[PDB]
Design a protein around this ligand. Structure first.
Ligand SMILES: [Zn+2]
Ligand SMILES: [Zn+2]
Lengths: 87, 811, 65, 115
């Protein structure tokens, strides 16, 4: 059952584009999104290290989406869920 | 000025558009709707605009003319149907107005403006008043095609036939409407000097059957659609009541009553259980009323408390062969050989869109006299085979594991059903079908195979009794038809062994300036009308001369129409009504397609030879042929064998066809087609538009002026002129992109075991061996890759090339 | 070799996605099959990779095994 | 005993369609005919006691079944058990002009025959 995912991941690593490997590295570090990227993007920030490496103030480099929605994990404004649109 | 004329004398025969109250006439309207050509169709535009059917900006829209893309062009045509009905009601207020005067003559189309009044009383002869007769055969014969293309009847069906008045609450329990049919006839077609029967049981020969079915369809396009369908009564067995069907009410053959009906029975044997389970009555009665808002058809849908949603899975990509191909340096940048054939997934909304594609289907009235002469010609085309009824020990049934239809599929496929019943039970069921109607419901599934386009393909599985009886009849007829070589229809001949070469040589025969041509029919199975399907079935039953009387053949035709043409489909978890168009379940639908194709071709030739003006024809033998063609079409009611033989010989000499279902190759004498005396392609376009309700775009019909390169494409194969040991022979080679696609994507039946994988690979290499002899090197490298891959597969467990060479040598 | 590999990855990714029974949501599976069929019809080099990253976000937004 | 197998299968199918079948209103509709010979398209239309409407989008829920009781076949129907495209039960208090894009289409409206 694993072999299909192994082949998928080896083909994806062979593809060698920027956005694919970026998203793979984010997800292996833990930074996964929570919905479909619109061609509105929701992302769960695991730790402050990924916030520092990816979010610069309000500018956010991800594949780039300019992000101002900050509340919390706990659904009270201050993990962190941030949703943005393509600018 | 240019105008359409319908003239006939000793000098000139045929409806011709040359140069000589409304601006335009009924003949012009029928010509513009019957001889359509989108390059030069300004007359149709002017007709549609001048009387406020729609606006010129609607024509400025792209594809204003089509029936398939943007199917809202019927809205207007319906307003012209209203005009047609108004002008057709003045044809009975003039005939009975001149008959009293006592005048013998013919009525032509070209004497009547679009309002309906007449002129030019020049040709008739005067006789004693009260004893006249007009000749109005050609009039209605040529006016027929636009009496269901525009309908007029949705306009007619009002409480006193005024368009400013509500719809009639007809009685919901009344079903026969025979008196209303006769009243409609005597109001609209009073002077049609042949007997019309409201039910088709009362007709005399199959030609009368066609005539009465055409009139029945035109008269049945105005009745409450909740009425056509099985007729049921309440029957009792061993005390408990049933609701089973004891008749049926077609649009085509009026009301038909079973003659073997058992009221107050006591027990049901196997055949009775089979027929009563096949009945839609028990299923439509035991179920909930449904209103599905997705589709525009009628719908009585039960059998479940919730709809089912089925999806189509994606393909299985094979990595080994693709890795081998990329190691062989294929799919490099800037190449002509790449992957383009894929497995597309689907939702079920795809199934609903497929049923909407079934919605792409109208009621058609076709012409009648040209239909009867085309049917005589097509019978002459089929005059070299032998038919008849056979017993259950003379059917050879192949591939016994197809779908056994609904609701029979719940306990097995057709194999169990055929090994359960003895021969005598099947003969008794057949003999019962010879006097009875068994309406039937079909299962519908989605098809799972290669395509080049995103759309979903579907397939239909028909019940066991209908296929069993079509099997007896057309097992005999098709085994007689397909075991021949060298005929017009090429079905069941292997292209191998020089077979394609012999086929092409027979296509050449002795034609003078051979040019090649081909076509395809847009939306074949969805738009094929009811009239032509009945006509094909009638031909296949006309091959019955010695076994059946009139009654048995009529009951068989009714069974065929009620089981294939207009039955109800189980689509998902619903029961809908299927308006028309063929089913994909038997082989006699590929042969109905063949007959349909031949019909289309013959009609095209007839139009091209009769709509051309003989005064510019320099020959006089074809001029006399055209004169006799007009005579045999619009004159004699009897059948004339000599002229039919003459015209069949003319076609076989000047128009050589190579026919497979829906896919044809035409070899024709070029100077004649330049003069128009054999079928061009614009004639086919016009015929398809006016008689099949699709528009055949010019980008899919091709023309090849050099014969030494063969058919551009037929049966999904290309051909090249190669030399093989001091012989120049024609070889078929495929599109190799399809071969690569079938190699890289397989569908998980072969993803388990390797033997069937090697079978598929050797078959693919056989279909694509001749690619070696094409000038390009890449195709031969494709063949070499396939050979190397089959070699590698054989080693890790037909491998030498010669095995595939001998596949294409005629020895 | 940069236009065929993307289609092969799209096909295998949609097969994996189906093998985790996302078809038990109408909207999500409809979006997935739409993106898949739009990839398998692409004749340009650029937007195919956008749709590929969008489908990989679809995969890695739910808790993949 | 495979012939008898499908025999008994069809026979039990017939008997279970019979246990759901016999009413008196169908008998009255038959006895209001000329000779008891009646079409098929009107048996479930005027006999069966439960209607199913499948609604693809919101504009036809707005134009067909706006309210609690709706009108079809010249009779009044009483709604129950509105179900989305995924066989999960939806309360009627959700189907609105703004919330429609958030819920799976189509929907299954199951009604019972109101006298
Ligand atoms: Zn007749
Ligand atoms: Zn016979």
């Amino acid at each position: 059952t694993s072999a299909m995912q192994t082949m998928l991941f080896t083909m994806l690593r062979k593809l060698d584009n920027d956005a694919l490997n970026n998203i793979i590295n984010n997800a292996r570090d833990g930074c996964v999104p929570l919905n479909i990227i619109p061609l509105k993007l929701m992302v769960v920030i695991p730790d402050y290290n990924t916030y520092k490496n990816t979010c610069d103030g309000t500018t956010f480099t991800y594949a780039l989406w300019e992000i101002q929605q900050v509340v919390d994990a706990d659904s009270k404004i201050v993990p962190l869920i941030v949703t943005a649109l393509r600018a | 000025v240019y105008r359409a004329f319908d003239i006939y004398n000793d000098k000139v025969a045929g409806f011709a558009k040359f140069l000589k109250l409304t601006k335009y006439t009924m003949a012009d309207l029928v010509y513009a709707l019957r001889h359509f050509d989108e390059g030069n169709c300004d007359t149709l535009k002017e007709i549609l605009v001048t009387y406020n059917c729609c606006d010129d900006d609607y024509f400025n829209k792209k594809d204003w003319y089509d029936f398939v893309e943007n199917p809202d062009i019927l809205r207007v045509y319906a307003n012209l149907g209203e005009r047609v009905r108004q002008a057709l009601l003045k044809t009975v207020q003039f005939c009975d107005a001149m008959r009293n005067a006592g005048i013998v003559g013919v009525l032509t189309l070209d004497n009547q403006d679009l309002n309906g009044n007449w002129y030019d009383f020049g040709d008739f002869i005067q006789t004693t008043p009260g004893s006249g007769v007009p000749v109005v055969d050609s009039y209605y014969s040529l006016l027929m095609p636009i009496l269901t293309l525009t309908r007029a009847l949705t306009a007619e069906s009002h409480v006193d036939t005024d368009l400013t008045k509500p719809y009639i609450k007809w009685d919901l329990l009344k079903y026969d409407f025979t008196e209303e049919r006769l009243k409609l006839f005597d109001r609209y077609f009073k002077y049609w000097d042949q007997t019309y029967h409201p039910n088709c049981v009362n007709c005399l020969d199959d030609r009368c059957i066609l005539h009465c079915a055409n009139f029945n369809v035109l008269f049945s396009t105005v009745f409450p659609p909740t009425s056509f369908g099985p007729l049921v009564r309440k029957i009792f067995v061993d005390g408990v009541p049933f609701v089973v069907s004891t008749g049926y009410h077609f649009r085509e053959l009026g009301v038909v009553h079973n003659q073997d009906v058992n009221l107050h029975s006591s027990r049901l044997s196997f055949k009775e259980l089979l027929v009563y389970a096949a009945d839609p009555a028990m299923h439509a009665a035991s179920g909930n009323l449904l209103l599905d808002k997705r589709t525009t058809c009628f719908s009585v849908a039960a059998l479940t408390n919730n709809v089912a949603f089925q999806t189509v899975k994606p393909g299985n990509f094979n990595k080994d062969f693709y890795d081998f191909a990329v190691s062989k340096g294929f799919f490099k940048e800037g190449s002509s050989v790449e992957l383009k054939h894929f497995f597309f997934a689907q939702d079920g909304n795809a199934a609903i869109s497929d049923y909407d594609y079934y919605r792409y289907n109208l009621p058609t009235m076709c012409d009648i006299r040209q239909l009867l002469f085309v049917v005589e010609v097509v019978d002459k085309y089929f005059d070299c085979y032998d038919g008849g009824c056979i017993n259950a020990n003379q059917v050879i049934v192949n591939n016994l594991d197809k779908s056994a239809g609904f609701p029979f599929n719940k306990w097995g496929k057709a194999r169990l059903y055929y090994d359960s019943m003895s021969y005598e039970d099947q003969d008794a069921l057949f003999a019962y079908t010879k006097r009875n109607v068994i309406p039937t419901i079909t299962q519908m599934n989605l098809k799972y195979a290669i395509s080049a386009k995103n759309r979903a393909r579907t397939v239909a599985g028909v019940s066991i009794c209908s296929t069993m009886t079509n099997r007896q009849f057309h097992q005999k007829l098709l085994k007689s038809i397909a075991a021949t070589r060298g005929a017009t229809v090429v079905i069941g001949t292997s292209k191998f062994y020089g077979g394609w070469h012999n086929m092409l040589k027979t296509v050449y025969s002795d034609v003078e300036n051979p040019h090649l041509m081909g076509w395809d029919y847009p939306k074949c199975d969805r738009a094929m009308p009811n009239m032509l399907r009945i006509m094909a079935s009638l031909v296949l039953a006309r091959k019955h001369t010695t076994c059946c009387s009139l009654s048995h053949r009529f009951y068989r035709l009714a069974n065929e129409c009620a089981q294939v043409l207009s039955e109800m489909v189980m689509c998902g978890g619903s029961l809908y009504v299927k308006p028309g168009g063929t089913s994909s379940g038997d082989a006699t639908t590929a042969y109905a397609n063949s007959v349909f194709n031949i019909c289309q071709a013959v009609t095209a030739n007839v139009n091209a030879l009769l709509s051309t003006d003989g005064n510019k024809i320099a020959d006089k033998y074809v001029r006399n042929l055209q004169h006799r063609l007009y005579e045999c079409l619009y004159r004699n009611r009897d059948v004339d064998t000599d002229f039919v033989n003459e015209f069949y010989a003319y076609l076989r000499k000047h128009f050589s066809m190579m026919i497979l279902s829906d896919d044809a190759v035409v070899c024709f004498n070029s100077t004649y087609a330049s003069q128009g005396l054999v079928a061009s392609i614009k004639n086919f376009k016009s015929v398809l538009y006016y008689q099949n309700n699709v528009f055949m775009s010019e980008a899919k019909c091709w023309t090849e002026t050099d014969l030494t390169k063969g058919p551009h494409e037929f049966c999904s194969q290309h051909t090249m002129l190669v030399k093989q040991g001091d012989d120049y022979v024609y070889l078929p080679y495929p599109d190799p992109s399809r071969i690569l696609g079938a190699g890289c994507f397989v569908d998980d039946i072969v993803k388990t075991d390797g033997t069937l994988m090697i079978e598929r690979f050797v078959s693919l290499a056989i279909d694509a061996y001749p690619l070696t002899k094409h000038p390009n090197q890449e195709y031969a490298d494709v063949f070499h890759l396939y050979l190397q891959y089959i070699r590698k597969l054989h080693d890790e467990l037909y491998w030498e090339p010669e095995f595939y060479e001998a596949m294409y040598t005629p020895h | 070799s940069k236009m065929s590999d993307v289609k092969c990855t799209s096909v295998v990714l949609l097969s994996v996605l189906q093998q985790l029974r996302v078809e038990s949501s109408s909207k999500l599976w409809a979006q997935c099959v739409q993106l898949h069929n739009d990839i398998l019809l692409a004749k340009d080099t650029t937007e195919a990779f956008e749709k590929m990253v969008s489908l990989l976000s679809v995969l890695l937004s739910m808790q993949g095994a």
